[PDB]
Amino acid sequence: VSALERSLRLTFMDELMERARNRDPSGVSEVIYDMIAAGLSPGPRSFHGLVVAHALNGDEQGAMHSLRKELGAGQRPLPETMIALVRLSGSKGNAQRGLELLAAMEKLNYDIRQAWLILVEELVRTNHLEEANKVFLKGARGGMRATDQLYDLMIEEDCKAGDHSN
């Protein structure tokens, strides 16, 4: 890794992260193709920026397409990419998609406790108490421990909804 390659990667990564921060996944795709033309191999960081850009403007299909580009490109997705995907699935209420992403995280030797908590909290926030309860119970029966705040939130919401069983 020369200083010239480092500077080119720095400029391209900066501009790509910029385009990801202004909710422009198409611009991130232009930057990725610019890296391809320039000979710079797209690492997990640029692709993570692409995934975040797709997920910021509530686009689940594009985010999963970017993850498919991850797996096709041969790069290992970052934990932040999977966290963004599970958060997007929870915001949209896609509990099964979040579970699939958690399984993929587990296959990639990652700690899925934080993602599980984020998914449960998002499902509760979006008012999907049934799927939130199912995901929480799956995690708890799997040996995973939740925070005190999440326990209290689950108990209070379930009892407010009249769901004594959960």
Partner: protein, 385 residues
């Protein structure tokens, strides 16, 4: 179902990757499981625009939804990989076919032929030809056209004219291809007598109109504003069989025009082809990268594109001006360093703009030029013989 497949097939034939992608997302958003034919259509649509990664992603998604690959999907995959010269992907797909047990038809053989031709592996191309004749099946016009192109590229005039006189004996109305790279190969060795003797028969062409128009315009008789309109209508008429045929037609025409001394005519033909839709990856202009892609072009098409790319550079700054000589798995290897595309581009740039366009220390198939070297930089003289 029928509407989706029809739209996707039309987009794939016309090289409309964006429309096929939009249709795919819209129809997936309605909880509709895609069929194998629609997936094949979008895959071949992506391959027209040299977007190999998108086509591979779609092919990977094909198995995820339960849609198993078909023969048409493999045919599209080999054709897309052969257009770009990605022969490594070609043999990988061939191994996939051999372990899948599906018989190999003429499409696999000729796709391999032009995959090795575009990659510069002439010896492997003729070896695969002799293997194609060894087993079974009859080559069509496409196979002999591909071998004529590979013979013309690898400075083989004698075998070229032998195949020419052998193929025209079948009363097959020889196409624009044969004439085009025959003029190219005759201009390689300054065979002006052969060029004129071919053009004498070429000009009349009582049977077809396309040959007559192109033969008139190559000599310069159709360069006027009113006389270029006939060429424009014939080009528009030819733009109906698909971008798969359009790219080959433009490649042959550009090679013939460049190698017959008609550099300005080749430049104008490339310019009118760009607005048509052929070669969509040719140019990229932005604050970061100013790129020219030539991995899907021939030697003649590369030189015309490089000539007009250098001229546009001098008009004006991007952080980098790059040349995509080789694109694919060959980049991460020294094999692409020796490739005819890479060496030809390097020699052209070296003898035109001196020692300014250097190689990449990280990629084995790109020609590089930093912004600092751009600061110190009409460069190529385009004239008609």
């Amino acid at each position: 179902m029928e509407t989706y497949e029809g739209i996707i097939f039309a987009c794939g034939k016309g090289g409309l990757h964006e429309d096929a992608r939009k249709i795919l997302q819209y129809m997936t958003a309605k909880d509709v499981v895609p069929s194998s034919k629609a997936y094949t259509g979008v895959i071949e649509a992506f391959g027209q625009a040299a977007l190999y990664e998108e086509a591979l992603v779609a092919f990977n998604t094909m198995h995820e939804v339960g849609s198993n690959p078909s023969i048409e999907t493999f045919h599209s995959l080999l054709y897309s990989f052969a257009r770009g010269g990605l022969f490594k992907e070609s043999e990988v797909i061939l191994s996939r076919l051999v372990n899948s047990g599906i018989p190999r038809n003429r499409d696999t053989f000729n796709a391999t032929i032009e995959a090795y031709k575009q990659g510069g592996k002439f010896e492997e191309a003729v070896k695969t030809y002799v293997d194609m004749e060894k087993s079974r099946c009859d080559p069509d016009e496409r196979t002999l056209e591909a071998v004529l192109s590979v013979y013309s590229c690898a400075r083989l005039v004698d075998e070229c004219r032998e195949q020419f006189e052998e193929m025209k004996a079948s009363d097959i109305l020889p196409s624009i291809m044969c004439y085009c790279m025959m003029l190219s190969v005759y201009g390689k060795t300054e065979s002006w007598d052969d060029v004129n003797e071919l053009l004498e028969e070429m000009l009349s062409n009582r049977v077809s109109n396309i040959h007559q128009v192109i033969g008139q315009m190559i000599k310069g008789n159709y360069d006027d504003d009113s006389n270029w309109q006939i060429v424009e209508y014939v080009l528009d008429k030819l733009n109906s069989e698909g971008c798969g045929l359009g790219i080959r037609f433009y490649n042959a025409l550009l090679d013939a025009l460049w190698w017959l001394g008609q550099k300005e005519r080749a430049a104008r033909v490339l310019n009118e082809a760009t607005k048509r839709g052929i070669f969509p990856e040719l140019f990229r202009k932005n604050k970061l990268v100013w790129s020219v892609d030539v991995h899907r072009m021939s030697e003649g098409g590369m030189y015309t594109a490089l000539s007009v790319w250098l001229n546009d550079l001098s008009d004006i700054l991007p952080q980098l001006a790059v040349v995509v000589s080789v694109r694919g798995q060959l980049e991460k290897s020294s094999a692409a360093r020796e490739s005819p595309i890479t060496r030809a581009a390097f020699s052209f740039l070296q003898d035109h703009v001196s020692s300014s366009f250097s190689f990449t220390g990280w990629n084995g198939g790109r020609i590089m030029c930093q912004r600092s070297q751009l600061k110190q930089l009409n460069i190529v003289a385009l004239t008609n013989s």
